[model samples]
Target: QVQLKQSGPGLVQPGGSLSITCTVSGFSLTNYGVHWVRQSPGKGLEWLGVIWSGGNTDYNTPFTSRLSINKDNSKSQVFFKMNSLQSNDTAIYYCARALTYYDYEFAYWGQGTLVTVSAASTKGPSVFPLAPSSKSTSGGTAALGCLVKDYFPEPVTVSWNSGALTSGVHTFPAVLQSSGLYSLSSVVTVPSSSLGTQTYICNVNHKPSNTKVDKRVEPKS
Candidate 1:
């Protein structure tokens, strides 16, 4: 009942260091251990490092020199660090987990994250988060997860507003994706008072101009 959302490169430079984060929901950190797995184009999968619920970790022999794994139980998230970025470091990355207590192998998986190495500076996230259907509760109360996908780098903001909606807007940390883009999700709740046909706007502006998602509610049956 848990889910993992990885992030793509926000800013990675050759010979420099970059850290990636994996956010999880619906699962407890006490039952699973997260691993950083990667694969280059036309290459087999590689195990970079792993971090568990208890916070202990280990890395592959080659990656140990410049790779580290850790987690934040309070946030239900895992983090990976890579130093001395090289051309070979450019590949698709993912975070997989096994049951921490049981002998669960890497059975479940998340989408991949891409990391590209270049001498130039970072470009920031480009892709926009995919918005989900609105969930209406008793008395017409509504709440939805505003998740972005196919984005790059980090730091994406999701701000959706309803003319009559009062509050319940919250943003989450960016997670890396395989294509080297970051993904983000936020929650926008509208009280029954504001549940009628209304304009819901999500602006994923990591910069001057990004994506503009104009959403409207059609109270689901």
Candidate 2:
């Protein structure tokens, strides 16, 4: 299996263009195509475009006119260029690869790099804070919510695991915001007696960091 990793600055000034690189290991540019995807600060995922091993390119319908994908096979890297940036374009950018000879859908992904559009900040990670949530309640039913802001176009997964109570397990898609962020709420129902001290976790999978888990405890009835 091939592994991909993305790296770039997290912030960009308004009106400045954004450039990101995706590097692949165990895959050859001559055998696979690299694709770019983006999610706005609080919206759903969007496929930005693709660059073939041979250097041919194709872009998503929404970005066809403004997006560009390039490659440096010798360095095992793919590059993306999106000009005339705006705050609306602030998102986590990913570079991924499709199986050779097959088109669409990614089988391999890189850890994503977040980019924010601001007038004075151009640093990485610490500039932004991750907002994850947790809650607890007694018995019958309880809901816990986790929200991630500014992650664009990446698939978010919500998973549940009870440390002690094993009666039920469920997973579901989160509601996505217009700015590219996503919110997921997981509800677990337990018998009143099973409520005390049980742990429920929600894990999100994305490129780069790959996964994040949040836990909630069930309160005593």
Candidate 3:
């Protein structure tokens, strides 16, 4: 099946950098182009740029100096990066695959990723990790939640027990409150058998502050 999945941070501090990835399957990047688009809240779609099959790029004039689009053909992934972010840069970004090398129309679109440039200071995110609400049932699974709130400069990376998480994990977009802080949530699930008699850690990496907070979720006795 033709698919495009986007992964990146949802929060960013003002003046911080942004890097997002779009992973594609069912089509080779060497045969198609990928377009980067964005839409602010209550605004129409904006074409940020595009990376053609031949590794060349075409960008909107406003972002030409600070934005970049690149790809790793071997990995079938296209990357988008920009710097000097401001509150106005907050938007939902999308990566769409072009129908053909000569056809610029978007053929397949990835789920958009929201990026919010925080108006708060650079104190980083405060995480409140929560243990599983209940014990795991036989042949079932355990669910854990982590509440990240009241921090500045949005983008924080969440991991499970010191490792990058993939399966059974979901992190919601960071939403700014009227108080000028950002909040978000991430959840992780594991098979009951796999979590038997053990504990796990929810780790949050606040890059701008270069700090990490880990909260343990022990198996319910």
Candidate 4:
């Protein structure tokens, strides 16, 4: 029944600062230290720092100066703050409760909050749709894949022929890249018999860049 709920702004301007709150329930911050971790867009998780139950703090070498972690026992809340933000600072931040004073192993984790820096540098997504493979025509169904990449701010909509594509469609969450952009793929399945006769289009709606890209695939008979 332990939970850590995190809340913060999703977007920040260049050179701005960030503050995130991790509110807890069913536990006491006075007895548990909190660890702060973050993952860059499409990169590995990086440990930022920890605030011990006694109000002492320890930070990772790289974040020793710009990152800060603290907690309030009465409020059962932990706070994380960072200064001097840039595009490379974009990431999803998470907070976790440590098992003990010196232990870095986390037992409970927060849901995570995505924080993006600077909207002026938003990039439009590139979309590429592939037709069903010829070999799939012999099977009961054929599969089509749409690759979308190089997008920023991450609020993108992928649609089939413009709307309401319910069946045989699966879209994965956009993955962040080391370059601070995002990429994802969507798959669509259709009857093998319709390969040459059907025209499918993949539409990418990226509002941040005010751009909508459409990629169509038409199989030749």
Candidate 5:
């Protein structure tokens, strides 16, 4: 079975269009159709559109009018284009191949390319540290870390939130490991005023479709 891998950025400005590429190595494009999917910063997945094995295309109702799918058979790459972009369109975009022309199910998927719309810069999220064995007696600060594999050219943002947080604070840096992966860490200090039985969420905006979240309860130190 062939696997698909996507490469692209993590940030796009509002109103700017984006172009991403999906590369496959083990299959012929004439025998397989490719589909594009997206996910927002903190939302579920969305089917943007698909390119058929014969060079035809079908798009989701919401994006059919604005999205376009094309490919270059000789290059083994598929292309996706979306114009008139908005903040809501920022997400990790992915490309996959379906065995059937129906495009209802995905058989192979790319890792995903995260894209964001904002004035500030963005980077990949970090991993969280293992929970302390002993419970704390007083409320205090804690640190969470995340590790990103197969890094891209664009930076990523690691954010922290609590209780199904719709958003949170983000941090970025240029440090990366030799494994071609990026590592990030976020530290949140509990203020005496807001400390309690609260939960914390760690999110990494790697691409529009690749945001990840982890949750933990705040303990009193």
Candidate 6:
């Protein structure tokens, strides 16, 4: 039943500083440190900083000057502050707790808080590359599949690449991931002969943004 609870503003102006709080009661803040992580549309996970249980802190090089991490032990709360925020700073923020003093990986994480910069300008949607996975089917058949995740802007058109050898290509409808991004997968049924010998592509056209990209891969199990 223990979980991290985070609170903060959803949007901010480009120049103003932003603050968010991560509070929990099921665990001892003095026994665990908190780490701040953020994600932009296309870029992968970005580690902003970390706040030790003893109140010490460390930060990523580019964030060293703009980010500050602090905590209140008595309140079981961790605070994240960012100044000189830019439009590109808009992202989904999460706070995770370390299980031990020497643990560098996040042991537990909060839900997530979305922060968007001023609405003066809207950038085009960012597309994430496809994650292609292949596995054995039956005696000699195989499944050619790929998942396109961590992409923003909705109503995406996901379809398999050209697979004339397959009886039919199937693409699942796009589903919204809890992290506020869209995800879906495409698959084709081909024999083992096609494995390592054929190319599989995940074609996505994110609309009405009209952003299209053909992410291809060779499925070799």
In candidate 6, what residue range of length 10 has the lowest lDDT sum?
A: 121-130
How much lDDT does each candidate structure score? 0.66, 0.62, 0.82, 0.82, 0.66, 0.71
1-221 per-residue lDDT for model 6 (tens digits): 55899884355678888899999777887787788899877776898888877788999899888898888899888989999888888888999876676476787888777776764332234444333344446666766666666665434556666434346567777786686666777666666666565666666665434566776656434
Q: What lDDT tens digits, residue by residue, belong to model 3 across residues 2-102?
A: 89999854667788888999999999999989999998866679999999989999999999988999999999999999999998898889999876676
lDDT of 4 by residue, 6-35 (tens): 984366788888999999998788787889
TM-score, every prediction: 0.54, 0.54, 0.59, 0.59, 0.57, 0.54
Q: Give, for candidate 4, the lowest lDDT window spanning 10 residues.
A: 130-139
Q: Candidate 1: list runs displaced more than 4 Å.
A: 99-104, 121-221
Residue ranges of candidate 2 with Cα displaced over 4 Å: 122-221
Give me the overall lDDT of model 4. Answer: 0.82
Question: Candidates 2 and 3: which is better by TM-score?
Answer: 3
Runs of candidate 4 exceeding 4 Å displacement: 41-43, 119-152, 155-169, 174-221
Best by TM-score: 3
If ranked by lDDT, best first, what sequence of candidates would result?
A: 4, 3, 6, 1, 5, 2
* Model 1, total clashes: 24
Report the C-alpha lDDT of model 2 over 1-221, residue by residue, as the tens digit: 69998874455677788788888899788788888877664787888888886889988787777787888999998889888788788787888877654587688888787776756421111111122222444445544333444443334444555234334444445555674454544444555444445444544454433445444443423
For model 2 the local lDDT of residue 36 reads 80
Please write out the lDDT profile of model 1 over residues 40-106, one tens digit for every residue: 8666788887776677777889887888777788888787889999877877789887755444388
